[PDB]
Design an enzyme around this catalytic site. Structure first.
Site, PDB file in Angstrom:
ATOM      1  N   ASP A 165      -0.360   7.582   4.003  1.00 62.64           N
ATOM      2  CA  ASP A 165       0.000   6.180   3.864  1.00 62.64           C
ATOM      3  C   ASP A 165       1.489   6.042   3.592  1.00 62.64           C
ATOM      4  OD1 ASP A 165      -0.627   7.495   1.426  1.00 62.64           O
ATOM      5  OD2 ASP A 165      -0.628   5.575   0.360  1.00 62.64           O
ATOM      6  N   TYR A 166       2.088   4.995   4.151  1.00 65.74           N
ATOM      7  CA  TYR A 166       3.436   4.617   3.754  1.00 65.74           C
ATOM      8  C   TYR A 166       3.419   4.126   2.313  1.00 65.74           C
ATOM      9  CZ  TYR A 166       4.779   4.825   8.701  1.00 65.74           C
ATOM     10  OH  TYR A 166       5.033   5.236   9.989  1.00 65.74           O
TER      11      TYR A 166
ATOM     12  N   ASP B 252      -1.626   0.094   6.064  1.00 66.74           N
ATOM     13  CA  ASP B 252      -0.487   0.973   5.825  1.00 66.74           C
ATOM     14  C   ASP B 252      -0.913   2.421   5.631  1.00 66.74           C
ATOM     15  OD1 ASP B 252      -1.599   0.832   3.236  1.00 66.74           O
ATOM     16  OD2 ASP B 252       0.376   1.009   2.296  1.00 66.74           O
TER      17      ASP B 252
HETATM   18  N1  LIG Z   1       0.983 -11.064   0.447  1.00 67.33           N
HETATM   19  C1  LIG Z   1       0.309 -10.029  -0.110  1.00 67.33           C
HETATM   20  N2  LIG Z   1       0.357  -8.820   0.503  1.00 67.33           N
HETATM   21  C2  LIG Z   1      -0.298  -7.752  -0.009  1.00 67.33           C
HETATM   22  C3  LIG Z   1      -1.065  -7.925  -1.251  1.00 67.33           C
HETATM   23  N3  LIG Z   1      -1.608  -6.726  -1.537  1.00 67.33           N
HETATM   24  C4  LIG Z   1      -1.221  -5.861  -0.563  1.00 67.33           C
HETATM   25  N4  LIG Z   1      -0.440  -6.475   0.347  1.00 67.33           N
HETATM   26  C5  LIG Z   1       0.170  -5.845   1.544  1.00 67.33           C
HETATM   27  C6  LIG Z   1       1.577  -5.375   1.207  1.00 67.33           C
HETATM   28  C7  LIG Z   1       1.583  -3.876   1.447  1.00 67.33           C
HETATM   29  C8  LIG Z   1       0.274  -3.579   2.162  1.00 67.33           C
HETATM   30  C9  LIG Z   1      -0.346  -2.319   1.575  1.00 67.33           C
HETATM   31  O1  LIG Z   1      -0.551  -2.520   0.181  1.00 67.33           O
HETATM   32  P1  LIG Z   1      -1.143  -1.338  -0.733  1.00 67.33           P
HETATM   33  O2  LIG Z   1      -2.389  -1.846  -1.417  1.00 67.33           O
HETATM   34  O3  LIG Z   1      -1.213  -0.068   0.083  1.00 67.33           O
HETATM   35  O4  LIG Z   1       0.003  -1.210  -1.860  1.00 67.33           O
HETATM   36  P2  LIG Z   1       1.458  -0.600  -1.525  1.00 67.33           P
HETATM   37  O5  LIG Z   1       2.474  -1.699  -1.723  1.00 67.33           O
HETATM   38  O6  LIG Z   1       1.431   0.132  -0.205  1.00 67.33           O
HETATM   39  O7  LIG Z   1       1.653   0.455  -2.726  1.00 67.33           O
HETATM   40  P3  LIG Z   1       0.639   1.687  -2.953  1.00 67.33           P
HETATM   41  O8  LIG Z   1       0.168   2.074  -1.573  1.00 67.33           O
HETATM   42  O9  LIG Z   1       1.494   2.730  -3.630  1.00 67.33           O
HETATM   43  O10 LIG Z   1      -0.448   1.103  -3.824  1.00 67.33           O
HETATM   44  O11 LIG Z   1      -0.586  -4.697   1.936  1.00 67.33           O
HETATM   45  C10 LIG Z   1      -1.070  -9.274  -1.860  1.00 67.33           C
HETATM   46  O12 LIG Z   1      -1.699  -9.502  -2.916  1.00 67.33           O
HETATM   47  N5  LIG Z   1      -0.379 -10.244  -1.248  1.00 67.33           N
HETATM   48 MG   LIG Z   2      -0.046   1.824   0.454  1.00 69.59          MG
END
Ligand SMILES: Nc1nc2c(ncn2[C@H]2CC[C@@H](COP(=O)(O)OP(=O)(O)OP(=O)(O)O)O2)c(=O)[nH]1
Ligand SMILES: [Mg+2]
Ligand SMILES: CN(C(=S)Cn1[nH]c2cccc-2c1C(F)(F)F)c1ccccc1
Length: 637
Positions: free
Chosen positions: A395-396, A587
């Site tokens: 994953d990114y 992602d």
């Molecule tokens: N607008 C919005 N976008 C979101 C929300 N949660 C996730 N996203 C989008 C932004 C990044 C993408 C992947 O999120 P992840 O859950 O993998 O979290 P991440 O930001 O990649 O960090 P990590 O993977 O380290 O948890 O999904 C949200 O509550 N609101």
């Molecule tokens: Mg992620």
DNA sequence: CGTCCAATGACAGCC
DNA sequence: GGCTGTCATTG
């Protein structure tokens, strides 16, 4: 008018058809599918997996004009010298390159899987699906139907769809066996329509500078998703049944403890029974603006009585059983070639921002690991690889944050992202006044929602309800954000300005999403389109980068390994070898890899994701390998 | 009268 | 008494 040429009826007519087909660099095909209505129908063909009552009786080929060359796949033929095996040899010869060639297929994914599973033919050409080209021109449009494509891009040939009501049913006209008309006529008409419509669609793609996104990204993504749907994802009935028992045991304890707190037994599914206990019996304070038992109301009442917290946990666990456990065990299917059960979700790429989701069932919505005081319920433990393999996850790290930093040119955000300090744990560290190492996953996930919420325009009232503070105090965090990251705020202001001028927004590859509400008179509808303009560019560019990485990985896997492309290719024809695409998580990419190839595939996947697109910020990628989706562990290579 | 975005989908609860 | 949307869940 129309002309249907049955090429399998005469030898000289067949050899002329093969001689012409091998010279065409561009043509269309449409599978002729019919249902076995009666045994007396005496119809021969190839059976389809799942729809055993449906046979593939033939195929229509068109390479110009209103001429359809129907390729009969039935045992019986007017020229018995043309045996079925001979026709299969020639059909396989012309559908595989040696030599650029483009095949136009409506519902390419299903046709690719049917050709492989039912007819034992693996397509080896370049593919063009008109419904994908329609999506590129407008990602918010309705899912295309054969009637809608002809109505818009080929209106002169509209009378060719009269009588066949299935033209407005999304599915291919030749693939929809529920029609009362013959598959020979339905496929012959569809091949002529999708061939001439694709010429107008390709002309519109070239005018919109989307012809390269169509050939290099979107259509190759469909091919990667086609292999995914053929692979499926492993499923452990024992692990799913085991966690169902742990959840059903916790429900009985909650229901028993809840009835004692209430003094009587009540229905957890009845809001009136819940409202009567909390408000009319326990005398809990009703909401300002109302006998509502929603999640927002119960969270404010958790600190007054333990019963609201028990109701919220009952709904969480019941949702994991009635909407996850039951569908997964209903959609599961046995794979005799792998010796295990798997689930085969259907991909969906007709989305507003370009993301990919799945249906029947939606594996993306499988709940995470949540704590249960009896421990953690890990529904993802049920998804396992084949015996002798591992599930690989790459994953990114923060793809949408890094795209935002690259587009906004914010030196501070770029500096924070280049540093290995987690942004979400740093936000929670400033929020709760704790050390970053002490931030749990529940708090980090809550800080994650705040981070993306504020970036995409969450107001002070909603932020206060999220952060548990007053609305006046929440507006100071937004002010600090707009001052701490002046580059992001300049990017947000200029995007709304450019969207008001152009009427659309563009992703990093050039895909346009039209947002006419950007100049609406309604203050709520106008601000909604503004937030959509910011999110579509960032979230859409993330979808574009993941699709690029998925296509490059699949290209590399088919060169590093000469094994089967998918589990469906092994069935259509040795221990399992290589990595198999099983799930995409926006992602994150999940691959089913044999234990011998785990190290090489992890290096192939990580390198292609980091080098998919060159940005001003490094695309950090983490790789994790485990015995299941829920047992993933860090893998550093 | 509803101000983070994207997505799927089985039931309470309709109008 | 079938027919929505709503509030679950995921990113
Ligand atoms: N607008 C919005 N976008 C979101 C929300 N949660 C996730 N996203 C989008 C932004 C990044 C993408 C992947 O999120 P992840 O859950 O993998 O979290 P991440 O930001 O990649 O960090 P990590 O993977 O380290 O948890 O999904 C949200 O509550 N609101
Ligand atoms: Mg992620
Ligand atoms: C004032 N603040 C800030 S700036 C934290 N931050 N850092 C970021 C890098 C990219 C987005 C970021 C945010 C955000 F959340 F604002 F969007 C804050 C807000 C709420 C709770 C705790 C701190």
């Amino acid at each position: 008018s129309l002309s249907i040429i049955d090429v399998a009826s005469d030898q000289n007519l067949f050899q002329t058809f093969i001689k012409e087909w091998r010279c065409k660099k561009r043509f269309s095909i449409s599978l002729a599918c019919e249902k076995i209505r009666s045994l007396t129908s005496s119809k021969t063909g190839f059976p389809i997996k799942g729809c055993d009552d449906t046979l593939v009786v033939g195929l229509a080929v068109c390479w110009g004009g209103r001429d359809a060359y129907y390729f009969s796949l039935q045992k019986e033929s007017l020229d018995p010298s043309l045996t079925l095996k001979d026709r299969m040899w020639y059909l396989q010869s012309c559908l595989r390159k040696e030599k650029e060639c483009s095949v136009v297929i409506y519902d390419f994914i299903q046709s690719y899987k049917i050709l492989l599973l039912s007819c034992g033919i693996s397509l080896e050409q370049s593919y063009e699906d008109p419904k994908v080209a329609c999506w590129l021109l407008d990602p918010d449009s309705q899912e295309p139907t054969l009637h809608s494509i002809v109505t818009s891009f080929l209106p002169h040939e509209l009378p060719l769809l009269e009588g066949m009501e299935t033209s407005q049913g999304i599915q291919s006209l030749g693939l929809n066996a529920g029609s009362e008309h013959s598959g020979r006529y339905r496929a012959s008409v569809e091949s002529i329509l999708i061939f001439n419509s694709m010429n107008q669609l390709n002309s519109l793609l070239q005018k919109e500078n989307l012809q390269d996104v169509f050939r290099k990204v979107e259509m190759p993504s469909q091919y990667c998703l086609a292999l995914l749907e053929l692979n499926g994802i492993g499923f452990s009935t024992a692990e799913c049944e085991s966690q169902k028992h742990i959840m059903q045991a916790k429900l009985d304890a909650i229901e028993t403890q809840a009835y004692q707190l209430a003094g009587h037994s009540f229905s957890f599914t009845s809001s009136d029974d819940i409202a009567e206990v909390l408000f009319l019996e326990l005398k809990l304070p009703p909401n300002r603006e109302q006998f509502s038992t929603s999640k927002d109301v119960l969270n404010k009442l958790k600190a007054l009585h333990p019963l609201p917290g028990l109701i919220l946990e009952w709904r969480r666990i019941t949702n994991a059983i009635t909407k996850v456990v039951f569908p997964l065990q209903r959609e599961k299917c046995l794979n005799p070639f792998l010796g295990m059960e798997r689930i085969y979700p259907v991909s969906q790429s007709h989305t507003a921002t370009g993301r990919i989701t799945f249906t029947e069932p939606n594996i993306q919505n499988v709940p995470r690991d949540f704590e249960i005081k009896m421990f953690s319920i890990s529904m993802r433990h049920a998804f396992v690889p084949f015996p002798g393999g591992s599930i690989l996850a790459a994953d990114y790290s923060q793809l949408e944050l890094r795209i935002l930093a690259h587009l906004s040119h914010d030196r501070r955000l770029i500096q924070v992202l280049n540093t290995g300090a987690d942004v979400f744990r740093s936000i929670a560290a400033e929020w709760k006044m704790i050390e970053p190492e002490s931030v749990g996953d529940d708090l980090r996930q809550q800080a994650k929602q705040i981070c993306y919420g504020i970036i995409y325009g969450m107001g002070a009232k909603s932020l206060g309800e999220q952060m548990g503070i007053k609305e006046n105090d929440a507006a100071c965090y937004i002010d600090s954000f707009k001052s701490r990251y002046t580059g992001i705020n300049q990017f947000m202001t200029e995007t709304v300005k450019n969207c008001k001028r152009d009427g659309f927004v563009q992703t990093i590859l050039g895909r346009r999403r039209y947002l006419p509400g950007i100049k609406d008179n309604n203050p709520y509808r106008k601000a909604h389109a503004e937030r959509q303009a910011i999110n579509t560019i960032v979230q859409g560019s993330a979808a574009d980068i993941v699709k690029i990485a998925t296509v490059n990985i699949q290209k590399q896997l088919e060169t590093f390994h000469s094994t089967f492309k998918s589990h469906g290719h092994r069935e259509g024809m040795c221990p399992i070898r290589g990595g198999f695409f099983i799930l995409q998580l926006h992602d994150e990419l999940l691959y089913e890899v044999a234990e011998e190839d785990v190290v090489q595939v992890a290096q192939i996947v990580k390198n292609e994701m980091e080098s998919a697109v060159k940005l001003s910020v490094k695309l950090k990628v983490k790789v994790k390998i485990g015995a299941s989706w829920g047992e993933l562990k860090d893998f550093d290579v």
